Design an enzyme around this catalytic site. Structure first.
Site, PDB file in Angstrom:
ATOM      1  N   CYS A 236      10.519   9.337  71.033  1.00 53.41           N
ATOM      2  CA  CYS A 236       9.403   8.568  70.510  1.00 53.41           C
ATOM      3  C   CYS A 236       8.148   9.426  70.600  1.00 53.41           C
ATOM      4  O   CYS A 236       7.719  10.024  69.608  1.00 53.41           O
ATOM      5  CB  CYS A 236       9.266   7.258  71.293  1.00 53.41           C
ATOM      6  SG  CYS A 236       7.942   6.201  70.737  1.00 53.41           S
ATOM      7  N   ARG A 237       7.577   9.530  71.790  1.00 58.36           N
ATOM      8  CA  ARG A 237       6.466  10.448  71.982  1.00 58.36           C
ATOM      9  C   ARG A 237       6.332  10.684  73.473  1.00 58.36           C
ATOM     10  O   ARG A 237       6.769   9.861  74.284  1.00 58.36           O
ATOM     11  CB  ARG A 237       5.159   9.918  71.383  1.00 58.36           C
ATOM     12  CG  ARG A 237       4.384   8.994  72.298  1.00 58.36           C
ATOM     13  CD  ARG A 237       3.310   8.306  71.503  1.00 58.36           C
ATOM     14  NE  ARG A 237       3.825   7.955  70.183  1.00 58.36           N
ATOM     15  CZ  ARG A 237       4.247   6.740  69.844  1.00 58.36           C
ATOM     16  NH1 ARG A 237       4.198   5.748  70.731  1.00 58.36           N
ATOM     17  NH2 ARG A 237       4.714   6.520  68.618  1.00 58.36           N
ATOM     18  N   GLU A 266       2.769  17.787  74.939  1.00 56.23           N
ATOM     19  CA  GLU A 266       2.420  17.891  73.528  1.00 56.23           C
ATOM     20  C   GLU A 266       1.106  17.203  73.183  1.00 56.23           C
ATOM     21  O   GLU A 266       0.505  17.539  72.159  1.00 56.23           O
ATOM     22  CB  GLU A 266       3.523  17.293  72.666  1.00 56.23           C
ATOM     23  CG  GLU A 266       4.767  18.147  72.564  1.00 56.23           C
ATOM     24  CD  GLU A 266       5.774  17.505  71.642  1.00 56.23           C
ATOM     25  OE1 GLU A 266       5.884  17.936  70.470  1.00 56.23           O
ATOM     26  OE2 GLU A 266       6.418  16.541  72.089  1.00 56.23           O
ATOM     27  N   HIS A 293      11.167  18.917  69.793  1.00 54.56           N
ATOM     28  CA  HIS A 293      10.605  18.117  68.702  1.00 54.56           C
ATOM     29  C   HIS A 293      11.341  18.357  67.388  1.00 54.56           C
ATOM     30  O   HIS A 293      10.746  18.700  66.363  1.00 54.56           O
ATOM     31  CB  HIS A 293       9.106  18.385  68.535  1.00 54.56           C
ATOM     32  CG  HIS A 293       8.340  17.193  68.055  1.00 54.56           C
ATOM     33  ND1 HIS A 293       7.236  16.702  68.716  1.00 54.56           N
ATOM     34  CD2 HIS A 293       8.531  16.380  66.989  1.00 54.56           C
ATOM     35  CE1 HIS A 293       6.776  15.640  68.077  1.00 54.56           C
ATOM     36  NE2 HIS A 293       7.549  15.420  67.028  1.00 54.56           N
ATOM     37  N   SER A 296      12.653  15.557  62.973  1.00 53.22           N
ATOM     38  CA  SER A 296      12.773  15.642  61.521  1.00 53.22           C
ATOM     39  C   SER A 296      13.220  17.022  61.058  1.00 53.22           C
ATOM     40  O   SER A 296      13.081  17.351  59.870  1.00 53.22           O
ATOM     41  CB  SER A 296      11.456  15.251  60.846  1.00 53.22           C
ATOM     42  OG  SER A 296      10.469  16.252  61.033  1.00 53.22           O
TER      43      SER A 296
END
Lengths: 329, 329
Positions: A236-237, A266, A293, A296
């Site tokens: 998620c983050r 990050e 990360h 994507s």
């Protein structure tokens, strides 16, 4: 005579040639992030910029680039942009919707399987050269019959639920907004509160949007509520998980494992910010599974993200209204 | 007291406790395979033995164990046992039901995701200490919209198709015997011939049932029919893939990657058998993902396998016909 477009990060050669018809392209020919001072130097004379995650577009940046007409962000979010500064400077700000959703969901499931089945240690045992057949080693935790909880039922949470629906698990979710009856039945997902989720799950997957109440959602207090021997998967983050509380929970036995695609270091939007990933996590190869990360990081998806950002730039430079615009200069 | 039971490999402590009620248990306290000479030294005066995949029971072994009344194999097959020698020596030989289907299907999907998303190299970059945020690297291959073909449609292939049904892929399969129409519709999987499967698939998964193993089903000829840039995932059996042909296809670019849970060097029943996993595969960390026969390495299944093998020993030691008997001594 042509406008100039600066791309802060590497893009596929096809995207450069596409932009070339209507603009002179200044690309980043390496796979590295350029220092901000070098980005600004290239963009000072630019009519357009393709921006990526590490770019921070503030008033200071815009003031150095008086010719800018459009920023085409190769991103879904715009937390790193001062939107109203773009508007006041006469700069279109565009984004790319939705393309990261499915690859992020697929990666989250990959992290779950790699962590719970000890696949990284498994690969190291193979590379050692000492494989001589099956041994009673690296016994992990299976999915079927277990309870997995998705915290947050947005686009990525729904993609995860659809994919895990064939795995004969007990799927729970919490969200202030419920799925409808058709969705809950199709995916066999049960709505609960967050406290019930944490109480019942073998696997906890946070996937919540950015908000102040999201900071350290998974802290020492939340981990204390979780089942002993559970696993936590964070794509998620970095800010949603307290990495120091995770380290304590792994050492005590509360967590059997932690997997992450994202890290607190990050967050360049924070002050209480660490500069590296904690060594106690990096050293703990038996209980962790990390990726840099890659949510994507699918070639076909990255190409389409770059293509949408490029089309937005072409449209804006042509005097059109760009398809992904979120402001109006 | 009173009968003695030798366990050739480690088992969970609850299995030791279960056997202890009716037998004196001599466990393997380590995760290692004992040398044959040590197994015989323990079993020479044992009444029962629990055998595992690395064991090999021949006439010579049995001649050295004159008190043996039962061998409970913690295994669904018995390739490594001279069954008629057991019978001639008055020894029951028992097996357990096949419980490997679901965890093997889950692991196969983990191999697929780990391989296509460059997750091992991703973990290596995180542990290097040099992660500084997102970068345009480690772009992999996605699942949605791609074509994956399952060669063989037995229990494990059906488990894989059910789980991949939620991933918005084009699923193909080939088998001499078709799935029923409700399954093809529920999983959106389409029957094709083997040649059509190899031609159309981005991902190829050999998963032939026990009744249909073909030596080198995936060989140089099959790989030449596959799409350039395709991926091959083998969690079926070492013999179904020609590993030297795979090495050549990785070198030529025909294959973008190979992942495997099983290896040709495992086949102890075939004569043309290698002793190590080829060095060119071990060195190719960029394009491979390997696990050391972890297909059923989940605690719940391992525990149930051990329990059924113990119950067979308990039954036979008490003078009953054990439930998993394959012979009549």
């Amino acid at each position: 005579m042509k406008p100039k477009v600066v791309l802060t990060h590497w893009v596929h050669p096809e995207i450069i040639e596409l932009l070339s018809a209507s603009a002179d392209v200044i690309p980043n020919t390496t796979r590295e992030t350029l220092p901000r001072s070098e980005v600004i130097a290239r963009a000072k004379d630019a009519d357009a910029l393709m921006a990526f995650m590490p770019d921070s577009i503030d008033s200071a940046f815009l003031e150095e680039c008086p010719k800018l007409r459009v920023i085409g962000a190769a991103l879904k979010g715009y937390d790193n942009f001062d939107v109203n500064a773009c508007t006041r400077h006469g700069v279109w700000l565009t984004i790319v919707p939705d393309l990261l959703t499915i690859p992020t969901a697929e990666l989250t499931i990959g992290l779950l399987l790699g962590l719970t089945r000890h696949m990284l240690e498994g690969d190291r045992q193979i590379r050692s050269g000492h494989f001589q057949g099956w041994r009673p080693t690296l016994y992990g935790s299976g999915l079927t019959g277990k309870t997995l909880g998705i915290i947050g039922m947005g686009a990525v949470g729904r993609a995860i639920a659809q994919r895990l629906a064939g795995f004969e698990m007990n799927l729970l979710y919490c969200d202030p907004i419920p799925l409808n009856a058709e969705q809950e039945k199709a995916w066999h997902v049960q709505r609960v509160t967050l406290d019930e989720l944490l109480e019942k799950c073998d696997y906890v997957v946070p996937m919540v949007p950015m908000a102040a109440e999201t900071l350290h959602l998974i802290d020492a207090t939340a981990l204390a509520k979780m089942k002993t021997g559970s696993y936590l998967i964070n794509a998620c983050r970095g800010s949603v998980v307290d990495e120091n509380a995770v380290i304590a929970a792994l050492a005590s036995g509360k967590l059997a494992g932690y997997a992450a695609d994202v890290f607190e270091m990050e967050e360049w939007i924070r002050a209480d910010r660490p500069q590296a990933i904690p060594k106690a996590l990096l050293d703990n190869t038996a209980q962790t599974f990390f990726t840099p990360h890659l949510g994507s990081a699918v070639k076909e998806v990255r190409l389409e993200i770059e293509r949408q950002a490029a089309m937005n730039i072409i449209q804006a430079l042509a005097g059109e209204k760009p398809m992904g615009a979120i402001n109006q200069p």
